[PDB]
Design a protein around this nucleic acid. Structure first.
Length: 329
RNA sequence: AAAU
């Protein structure tokens, strides 16, 4: 199947959606205000702690009204994150922050809050420093070619509109969608993005026993994708066509780390151990399949939505608006 | 089953 030959009639509609999702500078100032407020609070409780922003508010892919993610980093070998987060939830409530919720039995313990002063909502985790590093990797990829943020914005907005963007309900995180978008652009001919982890590296850090190494001098690559002249509507059609009809769900793994497709058997992801129904390898924690949140029920919904998206992109006379229509049972 |  070849891309529809009228595809460029729809580029402008997708650019307009992308531009509509860029956060307002006023919202970014409110993020900084809440971060400084939280830094002050934590400094009285744990003066030796340090706070780091990560996730959508720091990786270039944030939407308007996106929560800020904060990593509370603290040294020690006997750190009990649940006891810390329960103490922090009480400190947050006593400072008059709202909707403070501590989930200390989840896989990654977390406390959530909403600030009525800045209107910004926030989630805090303890010592998940790896997330700060993969945030930098995504931020560095985003500097290489504007089409990455454009495609990722359309895909993330689509996933929210079609209700397939919540790991608690068995669908995919925004971080997973951004990795899928990076991998798709790595595989274009010619490629729109390089494989930074395969290049001669300029950056390397170790967190826990995991070394994170890649070429991060991305200012040298600002025109890397210039040999590829594909437009945004072409890439949106191609992305959903891949996941709808080309991806081998039973056997294949998409790997931003290598810019290639790996085998499930080669990854030892052949059966649930951690389900492995739509395999997306984390670039640094390579034992982590980001699709493991998807189960034997939600995989059917995801694939059905991929097929709907691909067919809309190929055949609908107004594909941008139709693609993003909400699902109404 | 809840972070990135």
């Amino acid at each position: 199947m070849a891309c529809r030959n009228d595809i460029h009639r729809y580029d402008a509609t997708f650019i307009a959606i992308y531009k509509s999702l860029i956060p307002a500078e006023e919202e970014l100032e409110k993020q900084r205000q809440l971060m400084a407020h939280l830094e002050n609070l934590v400094a009285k409780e744990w003066p030796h702690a340090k706070l780091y922003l990560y996730g959508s508010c720091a990786n270039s892919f944030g939407f308007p009204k996106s929560d800020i993610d904060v990593c509370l980093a603290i040294e020690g070998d006997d750190i009990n994150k649940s006891e810390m987060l329960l103490k922090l939830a009480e400190i947050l409530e006593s400072d008059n922050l709202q909707n403070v919720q501590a989930l200390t039995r989840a896989r990654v313990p977390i406390v959530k809050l909403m600030d009525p002063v800045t209107g910004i909502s926030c989630a805090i985790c303890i010592n998940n420093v790896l997330a700060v590093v993969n945030t930098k990797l995504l931020r560095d990829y985003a500097q290489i070619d504007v089409r990455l943020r454009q495609l990722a914005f359309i895909v993330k907005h689509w996933a929210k509109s079609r209700r397939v963007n919540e790991t608690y309900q068995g669908t995919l995180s925004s971080y997973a969608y951004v990795l899928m978008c990076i991998h798709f652009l790595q595989q274009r001919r010619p490629p729109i993005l390089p494989c930074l982890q395969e290049m001669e590296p300029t950056y390397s850090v170790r967190v826990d026993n995991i070394r994170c190494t890649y070429f991060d001098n991305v200012d040298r690559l600002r025109n890397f994708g210039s040999n590829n002249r594909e437009t945004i509507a072409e890439l949106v059609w191609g992305f959903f066509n891949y996941w709808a009809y080309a991806h081998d769900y039973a056997y294949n793994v998409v790997s931003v780390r290598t810019g290639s497709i790996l085998g499930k058997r080669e990854k030892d992801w052949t059966r649930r151990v951690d389900r492995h129904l739509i395999c997306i390898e984390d670039p640094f924690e390579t034992s982590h399949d980001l699709g493991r949140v998807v189960d034997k029920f939600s995989i059917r919904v995801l694939r059905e939505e991929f097929e709907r998206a691909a067919r809309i992109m190929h055949q609908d006379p107004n594909p941008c608006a139709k693609l993003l229509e909400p699902y109404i049972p």
